[PDB]
Amino acid sequence: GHMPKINEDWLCNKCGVQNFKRREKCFKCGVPKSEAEQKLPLG
Ligand SMILES: [Zn+2]
């Protein structure tokens, strides 16, 4: 079926955490995912 693959995690640039893969911001540091690991061309 579908596969957005937005739930693909993102390693933070400050706290460096493995998050809930769907987080817009880190659970403790609160850095934006847009300011972290970029994904495949798909909004
Ligand atoms: Zn963070």
Curated annotation (Swiss-Prot):
Associates with the spliceosome. Component of a large chromatin remodeling complex, at least composed of MYSM1, PCAF, RBM10 and KIF11/TRIP5. It is found in: Nucleus. It is linked to TARP syndrome: A disorder characterized by the Robin sequence (micrognathia, glossoptosis and cleft palate), talipes equinovarus and cardiac defects. A zinc finger (RanBP2-type) spans 5-35. RBM10 transcripts also code for an alternative open reading frame (alt-ORF) coding for the MINAS-60 (AC P0DW28) protein. MINAS-60 and RBM10 ORFs are overlapping and are formed by shifting the reading frame. Binds to ssRNA containing the consensus sequence 5'-AGGUAA-3'. May be involved in post-transcriptional processing, most probably in mRNA splicing. Binds to RNA homopolymers, with a preference for poly(G) and poly(U) and little for poly(A). May bind to specific miRNA hairpins. It comes from the Eukaryota. This is RNA-binding protein 10. It comes from Homo sapiens (Human).
